[PDB]
Design a protein around this ligand. Structure first.
Ligand SMILES: Nc1ncnc2c1ncn2[C@@H]1O[C@H](COP(=O)(O)OP(=O)(O)NP(=O)(O)O)[C@@H](O)[C@H]1O
Ligand SMILES: Nc1ncnc2c1ncn2[C@@H]1O[C@H](COP(=O)(O)OP(=O)(O)NP(=O)(O)O)[C@@H](O)[C@H]1O
Ligand SMILES: [Mg+2]
Ligand SMILES: [Mg+2]
Lengths: 371, 81, 371
């Protein structure tokens, strides 16, 4: 009776049971295998580790990240992750539950079949379904039409959705997201007089980012304030107790989203990318995109991002056009929550792909149950 | 229709986080909520906004008996008891 | 979807919607109940009238002022006003909107709880929040740090404010404002030859004050000129056309703000009261208070008040200190305008007190949403 919802991000996998309001399991999308084939004073039988213990045992393992930029690049590694998710994390029997999986926008048709092959042939699922991540965000906020900007660890997308379906032609991919900011934050702190470089120092910066960074409504004016007073300054409590002082870096960091030239990127800016997608849609539905611009993914979590978006898009739009930005406080797990709502609706119960349907049609049935 | 009903169920039916197991039942506002668990960054974000919001200029024009005297900088009629 | 902003003045109540450039409803904080005629068969009218209709039917009513000197002194009558504001003035449902309320600086802890109690129990609001009026005025001018002189009906306050927090210890209250000045004009005009005392004549004097009074850059010089010339005299037509001429009373009336002795007060004067507040604060925030002195309230509306304030404070302050007086033209409605800006910011939307938070924490939760 209870469905499983598995949202596979580049950074973190989020897993749990449909109907819950949050995932039970959140862990790094990392598979680790022992370097050196045969030999070891390794352990029991474990030819693989997933998530945190792979991270803990980095020193004996070669680590892989199977889902780079939202797209799977190794199905063997991906299978290790799903295996870990069902048995180690949720502790359920795959063959007992229908399972809903997510995918990145513009996911190659090959991969969509592979996802379905593995779910039925490897994990013997009674039923399953595949959903575009961005679409689930929109659903989570009670909408079926709108544009969502979904920005995570590895990639960002603006995705125009009309009446339940993503519009492939107007999907823009922005090759900039969370880890470009982590890196950028390291750069500007180094400049200040501190030093972060080692992949453990990274994880420290990443914590600062998620805790202290924010978006200023007026960036220039905020730079002016930070330069002529120490009122914006905060000091961060490190592990080894070295209390570090961070000023205008707090807001110059998320600013990169709006001014990718800060990253040596000639690219566009989240607000302008959003505008360009809206413009790629038919004149007659644009209004609905404007009035329903949804934010999702950890990288949209900076306080002040919504009002700024609102202002930046209004500056690009026509007059009087109703620009509404939806940034719910839970938006980090909007994709998952959306998944949870959908799969737990009774009207969804016949939407599933059943084992029976797979046995006759094969991997390619997934195309018929989507776009 | 099979589709039409689901679309209605996403909008209509509890298409919201009234799901289960410790959530946010009710929330309000004028717009939305750019936010994280760290209330420090939130306040920084709020104060930066107050400083950055444009004047009355940016606001929705209204025709009030009083506010009329505001759009014409200095005016007056009956001020206070 | 839209929030409410309610600024309860000792004289005038102002209401409207977060995002608007001005309040919709502005009406007197008067509750009139019918006086007993001493009759047998005494049926006929309503038991309470509020605001305008209380004002017109004043002859047949005993009028009360629930909120005196900015502080609510009658909760039954206060509830009347609030009811009247939601229903008869705004014509919306309390239960459907988050409500931003304002308070006097140094409002007792007891009263703050009572406000919150009434908003969730009696008016069943989703959310609500309480702001100090003065702080809002500063926000209204787009600043988070500075000092505001708020002068309204019954009371004047100087409020040093740092990054969104008022500094209670450096708050000074001055018991002299609008109605004191109205009184004084009545006094001085009578001595000239005219006669005003009947409460219908007060309202005329109050109209003169708001239309013809000003603040002299140099009072003794202005008295001198007024004595050697009629050039500074102005005429005022009554309803019955009894053109009254008014001379140096035009600037002698507002002068009381700078010389309370004119009223037989041992008090200090707005310029010096402002100075003393700044002097109660630390050295490192003083420059910022001195360059950001904001005027708000009806009694700061006099022509020439800011230039005078600039001159007077420059005199009292250390040399070389940059004195800046900000007197926005909308300053009569800054408290409200400010609250409209605030409650319409996205960055504010998690700051509300929810119905949930109240149900678990109780009235005193309000104390937790400031300090
Ligand atoms: N409050 C925050 N402020 C800024 N960044 C944050 C915050 N919380 C999380 N992040 C970042 O969000 C990124 C991960 O977002 P998330 O969407 O959860 O990842 P994912 O979906 O697993 N990976 P992807 O495939 O790239 O979307 C990381 O770079 C984090 O540093
Ligand atoms: N243009 C003007 N010139 C001089 N006085 C004015 C003007 N407009 C209004 N007033 C006076 O301002 C006073 C009250 O203004 P207001 O700031 O609305 O007080 P309030 O907020 O209603 N009560 P409080 O809570 O005590 O401030 C009255 O005494 C009016 O006479
Ligand atoms: Mg994601
Ligand atoms: Mg007032």
């Amino acid at each position: 009776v209870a469905a499983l919802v598995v949202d596979n991000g580049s950074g973190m996998c989020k897993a749990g049971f449909a109907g819950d309001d949050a995932p039970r399991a959140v862990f790094p999308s990392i598979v680790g295998r022992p370097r050196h084939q045969g030999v070891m004073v390794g352990m029991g039988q474990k030819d693989s580790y997933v998530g945190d213990e792979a991270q803990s045992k980095r020193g004996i393992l070669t680590l892989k990240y199977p889902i780079e930029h939202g797209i799977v690049t190794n199905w063997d590694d991906m299978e290790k992750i799903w295996h870990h998710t069902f048995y180690n994390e949720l502790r359920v029997a795959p063959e007992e539950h229908p399972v809903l999986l997510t995918e990145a926008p513009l996911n190659p048709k090959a991969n969509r079949e592979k996802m379905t092959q593995i779910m039925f042939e490897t994990f013997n699922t009674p039923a399953m379904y595949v959903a575009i991540q961005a679409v689930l965000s929109l659903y989570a906020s009670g909408r079926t039409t709108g544009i969502v900007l979904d920005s995570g660890d590895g990639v960002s997308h603006t995705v125009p959705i009309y009446e339940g379906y993503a519009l492939p032609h107007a999907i823009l991919r922005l090759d900039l997201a969370g880890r470009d900011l982590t890196d950028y934050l390291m750069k500007i702190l180094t400049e200040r007089g501190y030093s972060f470089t080692t992949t453990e120092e990274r994880e420290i910066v990443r914590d600062i980012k998620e805790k202290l960074c924010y978006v200023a409504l007026d960036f220039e004016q905020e730079m002016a304030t930070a330069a002529s007073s120490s009122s914006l300054e905060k000091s961060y409590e490190l592990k080894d107790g070295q209390v570090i002082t961070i000023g205008n870096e707090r807001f110059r960091c998320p600013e990169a989203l709006f001014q990718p030239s800060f990253l040596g990127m000639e690219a566009c800016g989240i607000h302008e990318t959003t505008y360009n997608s809206i413009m790629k849609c038919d004149v007659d539905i644009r209004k609905d995109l404007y009035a329903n611009t949804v934010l999702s993914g950890g990288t949209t979590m900076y306080p002040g991002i919504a009002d700024r978006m609102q202002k930046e898009i209004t500056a690009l739009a026509p007059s009087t056009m109703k620009i509404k930005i939806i940034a719910p406080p839970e938006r980090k797990y909007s994709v998952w929550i959306g998944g949870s709502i959908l799969a737990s609706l009774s009207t969804f119960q016949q939407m599933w792909i059943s084992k029976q349907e797979y046995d006759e049609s094969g991997p390619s049935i997934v195309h018929r149950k989507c776009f | 229709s099979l589709h039409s009903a689901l679309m209605e169920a996403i909008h209509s039916s509890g298409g919201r986080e009234k799901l289960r197991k410790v959530a946010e039942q009710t929330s309000e506002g004028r717009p939305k909520k750019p936010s994280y668990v760290e209330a420090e960054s939130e306040r920084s974000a709020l104060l930066a906004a107050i400083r950055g919001h444009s004047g009355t200029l940016s606001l929705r024009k209204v025709s009030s008996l009083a506010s009329e005297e505001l759009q014409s900088f200095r005016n007056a009629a009956l001020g206070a008891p």
